[PDB]
Amino acid sequence: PTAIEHMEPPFWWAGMQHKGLQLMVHGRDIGRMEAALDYPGVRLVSTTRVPNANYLFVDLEIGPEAQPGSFDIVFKGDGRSERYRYRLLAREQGSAQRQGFGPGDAIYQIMPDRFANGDPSNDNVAGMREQADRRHGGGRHGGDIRGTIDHLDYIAGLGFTQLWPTPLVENDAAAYSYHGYAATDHYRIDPRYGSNEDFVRLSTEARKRGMGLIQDVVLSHIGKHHWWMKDLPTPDWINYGGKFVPTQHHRVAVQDPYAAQADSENFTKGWFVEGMPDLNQTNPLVANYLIQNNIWWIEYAGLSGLRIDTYGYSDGAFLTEYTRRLMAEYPRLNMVGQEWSTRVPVVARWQRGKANFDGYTSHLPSLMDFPLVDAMRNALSKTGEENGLNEVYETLSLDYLYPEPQNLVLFGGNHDMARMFSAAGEDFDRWRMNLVFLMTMPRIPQFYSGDEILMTSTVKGRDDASYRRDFPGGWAGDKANAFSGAGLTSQQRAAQDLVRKLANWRKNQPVIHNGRLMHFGPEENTWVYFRYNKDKRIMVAMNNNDKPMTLPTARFQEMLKGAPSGVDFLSGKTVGLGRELRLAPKSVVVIELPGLP
């Protein structure tokens, strides 16, 4: 390592909400040196050095009077002298008040590596450990930022207003580096995807197309080949030193009156696998670093928000301060925490403004609605079940447990679970119900790339590789091409047509975004619900039986209010609502009606 190998964060901005900034400087005996600076607006508060001489922490106070510009930080000591030019940048017009992703938005999820290979010459990069292999389910397939940029029109054309790629941060692992969740450098886009400047261009080109960028961020852990592991800043930088202490995933322990400390500590401090070292956020140096890094990425790349991986696995108090600091900087931003639980109360604990039994406060605006996805997936897979949708209905009834239930992210699927189409039992009619549900519910809708052309996977066992297959048309010489429509089967085309039809339609429905919901108890696996304000009503009625069903419309008259008939958006045909509602086998109708008197 040189005298300054790492300066983190590499640059900052003038006029941030939180005036403070702790620089993590890394370099040969840099911690044996005094620091000084001469710049108007900036004051050097203090320096903190640790037993490891190769690190120095420098505390700056950047006042409101401080102007955009650069200055040298001079390090004296050890009979040596060092200069480092530190840059304070000017913020973009309306940076702090930026519009986060909301109920109006629709999210398209991609795995950058598995989406599109716009540049084959960055499939392998000299120095990087893992060699690219498209034939291996866990290998690097070659997808990159160039590829994603090339087809932003496909995404915007589908009707989506947000792009959430899985992490693009450097994952210099020997094995399974494609997934992005084992960071080895927090401030560098993996060169296999492109440069840092390429990531900014992704955000700006998407912005032109009328799309925001949502970064997948990991706070809880890193990769075993992170440059920290060969030169640990502090002995307590990662949890459980050198001996492998795996977590046993007891998530309720942080919100359980009967919880043992052993379970609680095991959950927040335990490693996922031997290759993912768990960060210690109770160390204030680690906490500050993570907060600053994520803010850095938002400001630098013009992100509309974040998805926070493995949310609850980070220190609860850290998460409190983390979500506070980030929402202090961007008060209208949105961040969606991944809390993998099909239980509503377990998820609800983490949302902004939730009154908890233990007095836990949070500023996390959004969470992944795993309960509602799981209930609907169960309802469609369960053949013999007489009234499977009851599970969806009852789960929705629990929304009072969330402080903001209509701000949660609902999804057709993701990279971590069975393909949407396969989860429906490879049934187009059921898949349609799932799609309509997703697009009409009082939630932020998220869609996984490939589900629009009915991609398949295994439904049981662990087979993460099968959920993450290459997007047809992403690679040069692809048989099937989902971008142009070449090589697709009639069913795949119709599925793509429908996703496009429905999502673009959803963009022009403020009644789906901000309006109210009235649902009815499912009866004989049939379900009827309404989106409504004074401007519009949307009746969604679905029949989850392979026999035709007729529902008396007298039951729904507090919503119908005399309306004689309504035009289905899907089929186009007018459906009779006067006396009885005739529903076709395994069918769904989206009926639009005038505003309620």
Note the residues at the interface with its own copies (CB under 8 A). 248, 250, 252-253, 255-263, 266, 343-346, 357-358, 393-394, 396-401, 517-521, 523, 529, 555-559
In sequence order, what are the beta bridge partners of 164? 109
Query: Given the DSSP bridges, would you call strands 334-337 and 366-367 parallel, antiparallel or unpaired?
Result: parallel
Binding mask 100-119 for Ca ion (x = CB under 5 A): -----------------x-x
Taking the least distance from each CB to Ca ion, the nearer of 286 and 435 is: 286
- Assess contact for 553 and 575: CB atoms under 8 A: no
Taking the least distance from each CB to its own copies, the nearer of 19 and 382 is: 382
Sign of the dihedral defined by the CA atoms of residues 392, 576, 560, 502, in that order: positive
Closest CA to 255 of 351, 395, 374, 392: 351
CB of 256 to Ca ion, least distance (A): 17
- Assess contact for 538 and 531: CB atoms under 8 A: yes
Residue 543 burial (CB < 10 Å; 0-12/13-18/19+)? Answer: buried
- Assess contact for 16 and 68: CB atoms under 8 A: no
- Helix, strand or coil, per DSSP, at residue 187: strand
CB of 270 to its own copies, least distance (A): 11
Tokens, residue 472? 């047809």
CB of 559 to its own copies, least distance (A): 7
Query: Which of Ca ion, its own copies, none does residue 429 bind to, with CB < 5 to 8 Å depending on kind?
Result: none
Residue 123 near Ca ion by CB under 5 A = yes
DSSP code of residue 589: E
- Assess contact for 247 and 192: CB atoms under 8 A: no
Member of 15, 142, 473, 566 binding Ca ion (CB under 5 A): 142
Residue 388 burial (CB < 10 Å; 0-12/13-18/19+)? Answer: buried
Residue 220 near Ca ion by CB under 5 A = yes
CB of 269 to Ca ion, least distance (A): 6
Give the list of residues 6+ apart from residue 128 with CB closer than 8 angstroms, or none: 172, 190, 191, 192
Query: Which of Ca ion, its own copies, none does residue 518 bind to, with CB < 5 to 8 Å depending on kind?
Result: its own copies
CA distance 494 to 498: 6
Query: Which of its own copies, Ca ion, none does residue 398 bind to, with CB < 5 to 8 Å depending on kind?
Result: its own copies
Tokens, residue 590? 């989206």
DSSP code of residue 445: E
Residue 148 near Ca ion by CB under 5 A = no
Which residues define the annotated binding site for Ca(2+)? 117, 119, 122-123, 142, 144, 220, 268, 278, 313
DSSP code of residue 238: B
Residues that contact Ca ion, how many (by CB under 5 A): 9
Tokens, residue 69? 């510009």
Residue 198 near Ca ion by CB under 5 A = no
Member of 130, 144, 309, 451 binding Ca ion (CB under 5 A): 144
CB of 520 to its own copies, least distance (A): 5
CB of 342 to its own copies, least distance (A): 10
> In the range 518-547, which residues lie near Ca ion by CB under 5 A?
none
Query: Which of Ca ion, its own copies, none does residue 313 bind to, with CB < 5 to 8 Å depending on kind?
Result: Ca ion
Query: Which of its own copies, Ca ion, none does residue 197 bind to, with CB < 5 to 8 Å depending on kind?
Result: none
Q: Report the length, in residues, of the chain.
A: 597
Query: Which of Ca ion, its own copies, none does residue 572 bind to, with CB < 5 to 8 Å depending on kind?
Result: none
Distances (CA, A) of 429 to 318, 319, 435, 544: 45, 42, 10, 9
Taking the least distance from each CB to its own copies, the nearer of 343 and 536 is: 343
Taking the least distance from each CB to its own copies, the nearer of 519 and 536 is: 519
Sign of the dihedral defined by the CA atoms of residues 380, 382, 387, 390, in that order: negative
Element (H, E) at 557: helix 557-560
CB of 322 to its own copies, least distance (A): 24
Q: What angle do CA 166, 172, 175 make, to 5 degrees?
A: 85
| Site stretch for Ca ion (CB under 5 A), options 90-98, 217-225, 365-373, 398-406 | 217-225
Which residues define the annotated binding site? 117, 119, 122-123, 142, 144, 220, 268, 278, 313
Taking the least distance from each CB to Ca ion, the nearer of 144 and 329 is: 144
CB of 395 to its own copies, least distance (A): 9
Tokens, residue 417? 């679970």
Provide the Cα torsion 459, 461, 467, 469; round to 10°.
-110
Tokens, residue 212? 């925001």
Member of 313, 322, 370, 402 binding Ca ion (CB under 5 A): 313
Taking the least distance from each CB to its own copies, the nearer of 63 and 521 is: 521
CB of 291 to its own copies, least distance (A): 30
Tokens, residue 89? 């940048």
CB of 391 to its own copies, least distance (A): 10
Largest CA distance in the chain: 93
Taking the least distance from each CB to its own copies, the nearer of 204 and 266 is: 266
> In the range 239-278, which residues lie near Ca ion by CB under 5 A?
278
Taking the least distance from each CB to Ca ion, the nearer of 86 and 267 is: 267
Taking the least distance from each CB to its own copies, the nearer of 255 and 310 is: 255
Residue 177 near Ca ion by CB under 5 A = no
- Helix, strand or coil, per DSSP, at residue 276: coil
Taking the least distance from each CB to its own copies, the nearer of 255 and 362 is: 255
Element (H, E) at 526: strand 526-532
Q: Which residues bind Ca ion (CB under 5 A)?
A: 117, 119, 122-123, 142, 144, 220, 278, 313
